[model samples]
Target: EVQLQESGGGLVQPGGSLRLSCAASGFTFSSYWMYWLRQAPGKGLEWVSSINSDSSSTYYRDSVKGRFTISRDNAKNTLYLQMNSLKSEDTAVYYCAKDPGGYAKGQGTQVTVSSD
Candidate 1:
């Protein structure tokens, strides 16, 4: 019955920033670690970042270490992905996943980056 729904992604101009949300339900949000990942069109999946269940630690991939942030709100049972200094290559389908058990994933939020 666990579920994760992603939202807040859309057209983002170059140099813009984006904050995506993943709402979790039917499970203990603070009891499972969460991950943020993305996939470019027709490309393989890429790991962006992750947050520990206790919110005590966070990790980001080298590719996005300085430009991406992953966090969560236990009271709201939601996960968040914040990306800065967007570029065309940053456009992709972003997903949030829960770890240590079922590995449930969000439906994905499509993000497009362009100036026009």
Candidate 2:
């Protein structure tokens, strides 16, 4: 049973940073591509980033190009997302997915960007 579990997200203040995690299991982590996506409250899903199966390449959406990073740990079978300079508009539920075609997704992490 292939699985992707996402964690490491919570309250984040404006200008702060957050690191989200996606732990992959039940398959060879280095053999498949991984993607990160997010959906803001009452909004449609949006692509954030993606990493190649071999960890040789990565792609990010223009909106998050400078502030978002995607990386992986083949040895630990985990993928990570780092977001910096956040704002209230950044609040969303983030997800990690396996393979562009297969689209096996994690449970999603709720991130709130607030100053309180």
Candidate 3:
């Protein structure tokens, strides 16, 4: 089956960096824009940000401003999400998705964030 895997150090101390990568398979890398979303423990999901793979352009939800970045590596069909100066409140399932229009093609990845 097609998949997107999230890989990174799952825990980080407060004020540290949180970095994760999503490697995609089973589709053309250039075919879509990449997006990162959030799921706060018991809350519903939120659109954290998105980036056009070929253009490196980005759009982010205003609340998450100043602490996050979304980047992609087309050669590897991968997308990355990095948050700087993390706080415990930043803990959540950070998902990387490929936008095939508004509907993403691959499954989203779940990541647990915590202080190291």
Candidate 4:
């Protein structure tokens, strides 16, 4: 029974970055592969990236290939994502997901990017 908590908040200015974290509990963090997904207002979910906690290796979707970086803190029981060069088009809700049998999802973190 693994649980995930995502932290970090709204309103990132253009050209800024969103450094979000997902804290995990109830199991060994290194035992699972962690991932993130994005969803727009009227669109379905988009693959973001995935990270292997034990190997410290990362893979990203074609869309996010050069835009995001995925990593984790094994001792801290947390997975992290750094989304850089923010823009209004980057506004969306992000979810932290775990791969056990499949993806066991966590709550979404609503991220908003402003022109300011």
| Candidate 2 ranges beyond 4 A from true positions | none
lDDT of 4 by residue, 39-62 (tens): 879987877888885755788877
Ranking by lDDT: 2, 1, 4, 3
Give the RMSD in angstroms, all C-alphas superposed, for model 3.
Answer: 2.9
* Positional deviation of residue 26's Cα in model 1 after best superposition, in angstroms: 1.8
The worst-scoring run of ten residues by lDDT in candidate 4 lies at: 99-108
What clash pairs does model 1 have?
none
Q: Please report how far candidate 2 places residue 75 from its true position, in Å.
A: 0.8
TM-score of each: 0.91, 0.91, 0.80, 0.85
Clashing pairs in 2: none
Positional deviation of residue 81's Cα in model 4 after best superposition, in angstroms: 0.5
Query: Is 3 or 4 the stronger prediction by TM-score?
Result: 4
lDDT of 3 at 16: 78
- How far residue 59's Cα lies from its native spot in candidate 4, in Å, is 1.1
**lDDT for each of the candidates?**
0.86, 0.87, 0.71, 0.79
Tens digit of per-residue lDDT, candidate 3, span 22-57 = 888877766777777767667876788888767558
Clashing pairs in 3: none
Candidate 4: C-alpha RMSD to true structure equals 2.2
lDDT of 2 by residue, 57-114 (tens): 9999887888988999988899999999888888999999885532688889999999
Off by over 4 Å in 1: 100-103
Question: Looking at model 3, how many pairs of residues clash?
Answer: 0
